[PDB]
UniProtKB/Swiss-Prot annotation, chain A:
Belongs to the herpesviridae major capsid protein family. This is Major capsid protein. It is found in: Virion; Host nucleus. Self-assembles to form an icosahedral capsid with a T=16 symmetry, about 200 nm in diameter, and consisting of 150 hexons and 12 pentons (total of 162 capsomers). Hexons form the edges and faces of the capsid and are each composed of six MCP molecules. In contrast, one penton is found at each of the 12 vertices. Eleven of the pentons are MCP pentamers, while the last vertex is occupied by the portal complex. Homomultimer. Makes the hexons and eleven out of twelve pentons. Interacts with triplex proteins 1/TRX1 and 2/TRX2; adjacent capsomers are linked together in groups of three by triplexes, heterotrimeric complexes composed of one molecule of TRX1 and two molecules of TRX2. Interacts with scaffold protein; this interaction allows efficient MCP transport to the host nucleus. Interacts with capsid vertex component 2/CVC2. Interacts with the small capsomere-interacting protein/SCP.
Amino acid sequence: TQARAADAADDRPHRPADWTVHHKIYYYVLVPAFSRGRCCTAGVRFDRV
Amino acid sequence: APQFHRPSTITADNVRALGMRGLVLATNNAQFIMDNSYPHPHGTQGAVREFLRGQAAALTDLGVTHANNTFAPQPMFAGDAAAEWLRPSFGLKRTYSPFVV
Amino acid sequence: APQFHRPSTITADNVRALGMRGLVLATNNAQFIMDNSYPHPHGTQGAVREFLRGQAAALTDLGVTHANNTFAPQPMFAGDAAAEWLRPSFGLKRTYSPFVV
């Protein structure tokens, strides 16, 4: 999921360290405020998509 | 010709040789009762493996036919250029309208 | 040719053979006085039953005269696709402009 299609790695993190922290602030904090408890996280059928 | 109510007949090349316009209709004109007596050897879910190798291949056959319709798609991101040492690498946010008049 | 002041005259074939444009003027040029000499064999409500089996059968008969003006009726709801093990079933909200030029 990195930008460089040429540069892939096994274990090296290409995103910054704050990239992961900003995610949990979004989904766990802003999302319950705007959903007010009506939202879900669904598994994906990529074959049918 | 591929038949969508038989599993062991659906391959990629039987789909790729058909155009993407008629590929919509052939899955829309199959039989609602499926024949299961001749299954695909890699599982029935393995029949889904080959067909999404098949539509993705026929995207390119649609892509060649509109190469006279769009321009050349440049690299999107930096770090990919030939002479990076006297001038740097850009990358085009593919946001314009590629259209050949 | 049905006479709408006599309830024992209206059949489905007397209404369907008459055109939808001519059905407007045939009923509007009828008689105010309702004759009670020959009632309908299924009662007076039995003629109200038979009166609508001829009109609504001309909905598709006017659809034939308008079939060269719109497109084929797509599925509008779920569970309607041929190869449902590889791709699902859609349904068109007919919010577009069905019109054939």
